[PDB]
Assembly symmetry: D2
Homo-oligomer: 384 residues x 4
């Protein structure tokens, strides 16, 4: 008799995540790849994703949104450099240095008033080319800042960076905002004398749809949302056919019950539908209780590489499938999404006088466990 205490789960193939970092490297001819892992790896797991990237050498740094995620990654024996995005308290200086964490330089004032400290602090200089309040938007302030950095050998400039807000939007008003931002980048950086291997310009969207524009430096790319294999444009643009990003995640379940049901028998109590032929029917332990179900098509599932049909009434915790032959209980089932490229995260920003709130959150089956598959998963110790 068998007990199923894990009837559904999100299956995450870490090989495919690695592969995605590898593809987008080749697509952009990038030197360095900085893997952006916000919201616990876009709700897929930052640690396992990070370990997979360290072992395959497919990322050269990791970017995260909170100091406490940097510290946890360090605890998990990640050794790559890590860059935390919105943290720069003078009081955390010791933590940043001791744990080799890169931080963003937010303003000229911040650099001028840097207190004294031991060791090397790795810093990134953010170029406000428009749609943000973080960092530098004046050419004279940037060179003031480059002076303070150069003069101080305890400061190690990790990156001079920006990103384009409208690379993932379609149209004309957006092509022109893109140009405007690229103008500002150049106005703000040309003739400053920056070692050009420090430039980082490309977020996911920039990497995908502007890889042939020579004006964009791919010195250090910063792929985030695209790591999961989704379409970053939310419907607006089509993925380039030549770029082969793999969708890395699936929602899965398993067969909890198999019944031989005969040619005309009723499929369930109260049911409209009868069954077309002698043959087996599987009951899967999900239904309308599962809020994630409403992003899945409800006519088919995948079992054994093949696509068998959903028949009858779905209940709160039961979905039935006509099988092609008999399968044993415990056989894996994979759900199919209405839209394969649909986002798995949502972002919410708010701007106030002295504070910017930037919250990313999962929208993929938040209440079920993440399971890691594939050879890479075995090697990093995440595949039990």
């Amino acid at each position: 008799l068998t007990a199923i205490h894990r009837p559904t789960w999100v299956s995450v193939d870490l090989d495919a995540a690695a592969h995605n970092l590898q593809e987008i490297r080749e697509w952009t001819k990038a030197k360095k790849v900085y893997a952006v892992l916000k919201a616990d790896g876009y709700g897929l797991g930052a640690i396992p994703l990070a370990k997979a990237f360290q072992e395959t050498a497919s990322a050269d740094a990791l970017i995260v949104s909170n100091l406490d995620e940097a510290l946890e990654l360090r605890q998990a024996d990640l050794t790559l450099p890590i860059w935390v995005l919105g943290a720069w308290d003078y009081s955390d200086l010791k933590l940043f240095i001791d744990h080799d964490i890169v931080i963003t330089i937010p303003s000229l004032a911040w650099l001028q008033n840097l207190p004294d400290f031991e060791g090397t602090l790795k810093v990134s200089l953010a170029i406000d080319t428009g749609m943000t309040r973080i960092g530098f938007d004046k050419a004279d302030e940037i060179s003031a800042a480059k002076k303070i950095i150069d003069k101080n050998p305890q400061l190690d400039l990790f990156s001079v960076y920006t990103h384009f807000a409208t690379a993932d939007e379609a149209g004309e008003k957006s092509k022109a905002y893109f140009e405007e931002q690229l103008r500002r980048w150049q106005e703000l950086t040309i003739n400053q004398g920056f070692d050009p291997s420090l430039f980082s310009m490309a977020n996911s969207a920039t990497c995908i749809w502007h890889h042939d524009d020579p004006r964009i430096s791919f010195a250090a790319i910063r792929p985030g949302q695209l790591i999961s294999g989704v379409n970053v444009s939310n419907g607006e643009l089509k993925m380039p056919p030549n770029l082969h990003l793999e969708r890395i995640f699936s929602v899965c379940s398993e067969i909890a019950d198999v019944r031989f049901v005969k040619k005309d028998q009723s499929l369930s109590y109260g049911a409209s539908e009868r069954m077309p032929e002698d043959g087996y029917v599987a009951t899967l332990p999900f239904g309308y209780n599962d809020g994630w179900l409403r992003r899945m098509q409800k006519s088919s599932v995948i079992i054994n590489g093949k696509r068998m049909p959903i028949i009858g009434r779905i209940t709160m915790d039961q979905t039935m499938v006509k099988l092609d032959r008999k399968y044993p209980i415990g056989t894996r089932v994979t759900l199919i999404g209405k839209d394969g490229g649909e986002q798995i995260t949502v972002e919410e920003v708010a701007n106030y006088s002295h504070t910017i709130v930037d919250e990313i959150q999962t929208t993929l089956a938040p209440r079920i466990k993440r399971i890691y598959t594939g050879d890479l998963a075995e090697v990093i110790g995440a595949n039990y």
Copy 2:
């Protein structure tokens, strides 16, 4: 200028969890305490909870629902014995032995057909006293089984155990099911000759509301849901006043904006309400986007130990509070629940011919991060 990338979170005080294991030990005069951690520590975090229990010695074993959680706990350097609840595949025998995992004996057939193996396999004998299909419901089968175990010195009997389904229900039909189950336990175990220090009878509800019944052995108690400090009876029974379980979790946020708003000014665009007096108002970065909000009272929050009122219209991501003095941005806020003892998990079971599906899931703000506070948290390396 400050960036808030973590505007809300669930704060989990591990000292209070420890304290709860300690209280319920004294309440039941228990010798051994086995901490039940299903659904990732009842959605609060099994690893940090387990580490807190190992360091304080407040639990002597850990019980979990899936092998893969046992393996992860082992990876996290938990050394206490661990007992996985619904796993007993002969093919996992090696894993169980090598990682010191206790398993349940599900049936006499299973014991008779045990294959050969190396090392000591730790096993638990489950007494079906009624509301379940797992384990032994016949007095002769139990003694058959005790023979096979005794004869085999590689089998180490960890527990002989049951639990009462209706300890957490109120009434007369339920007091009698309780008696019926206790009759079966005794019919099934008296005169079997079991070392009585192996008996485990008490789930959370048994521990709470039947601690004075001498007929219940508290040799090894199995507190699960009560670890979090909630009321396990879902409204039905009142917690004993003398038992002081602490609620261990809170949903928190922080002040994102403070505005001096004057005696009659409008509080927000389109708003019914004006403000009663000269004084400060804080904007908190949550609102109706947050599904967890609907379990919280919307008239007050706690700031600085004190209880300040919510004023005006709550939006999708903004809630406003009249403060007693001025506070700086970043000041912690704690939400207050409509019902402090409300459950933080939901359980769903399904029974089929050859399989039992038992799914527990969090119902507390599944999309936000768990943060660990308190001295114990510092000591186990979970408080960054």
Copy 3:
């Protein structure tokens, strides 16, 4: 074989609505009763409610929120005077007069600039005693206005009126706002010379919890939400024991299937629960598809005046009940609410520079039909 095309419905007893108007008349010793019917009779049906009040003489006027509801009521052969609450366009003057519709005087300017017209225009003078922007808040403007009205015999003053915002709230800050408003009423109306039989002061809450305060005139009461028999205070205050308002509505369904199920048989596919005794079980055609279900207790229903228990798993469209004897299909079932006095409407207001938005909406099973029961229902032609 029988077809159920109306499996659930809201049953509205018009006798009980009448009775409620009658009770609250006696409770307040009121002379005139103006029945407030917003949001289609609080989502219970303004026309049938209005006809029931005309036939029993239990209301002397009707108040509604939109001109178009006044016009419809007129079409339905309601002859009582009707007062539309937020309409006063000079262009609708003809409609108001021809259809005997009372309108509110919103401002002194409006009265001074009244154009010329034929017939008698019935008008109400609203006293802003605080929490509103409609009508008159200055003692000199009121007497200016009484002059213009008196001088013009085509204007017929129907009411001079206000209401108290905090009669339905509990506490000290609210008892004092009540006093403040009552001060303003008196400051604004004493020594103006108004025929006192025109005063209307009491909304539902004023009628219920302040019927013994001699300072409140009950000359013409304006019961609205209380007509349905709910508690207007949303939890805050307890209904006076001596006032016997009847809850007028129920959500009902009917038995769609009866099965003899035997002493141990399984109740449904996949089900935890078996059935306690030989005896009949009814299937009711509602379940979790029905959003209204989440306001109902899910342990019992009423059949035949008696209270039979709900057993087993509720599906999307099926709920099962153990019956005491056998009943025939088509037998009525009545649902029981978690909270009998719970509101059946929600109100949303917004204030802007030149406009006030005041939206009331049903929260009781908006997608199912209203059925009218009782002798009064037969008499007014609404009980088919």
Copy 4:
């Protein structure tokens, strides 16, 4: 100062509904048109729809799902014949006859056991050609039944009818079920001797996608869901380009506030977005409180025939729009649907031993009022 007590509504153009009945008559060369009005006119209003069809002569009968809807229609002075679909109690015989209501003959037994009665009972003979349990599936029973009818001159055969379940589905398995049903119709009706002008074969889907098949009689068509102008196939099939069904309904609102907002100003508190140019912005009194909003695109609305953009954060009750010039408050706004042809009803059926539950319900903004526009609306007295 203006009060908006009706901030949103569903606008229903009755001319367009008439027009749809007219089109589908010409498309199928139909003689008689029976307008199917289930679920209160598909949640758009059966009475106003019926009156519009009587006045324009665009329907020759009306079909509804409940006796009580027939009775109400009669009360509203509809004189066309009415046919109630699942009612045939011998006890209602008097009601059916006195109110000229056609009923379905459900079985040979029912006809044989007809009791004695006065007047003419109009009856319809339903041919079970497959997917139903109502009516006749045997050739000998049909001729038995035609004998009993012919012999009795108080029975007036109104229709001999069926419909095709898979006319609104796409594919091969469905083209063949269609053929199978058409085979059964013919097997069951040819050589029976029925006056062929009594045949009714075509539901909405049959009318739309099979109008050129000569094997289908369009003697009396039964258009239901298509009356509203939606796509009956739910995505599966494309409407024929030559058939010009009009969508008859809109969700509307109105401008509650207009603000001159200047070239860079912030659009709302906490807001990411600033405004591109000097110019006016309207606030509309809907937002995420409105569950219907989630079927509407949130980038544009229609004002004055033109399409102006939605800018900024939508709140619970506020949506903002950049206008092309200044408009006055009270100006109508029309929402645009993600999918113009999307269904406005959902149907749920359940089959049990002695009963069939067939529930249709609105899915279009159930809590807001239906407003009727157009010249036809004026003429039938529904446009106030």
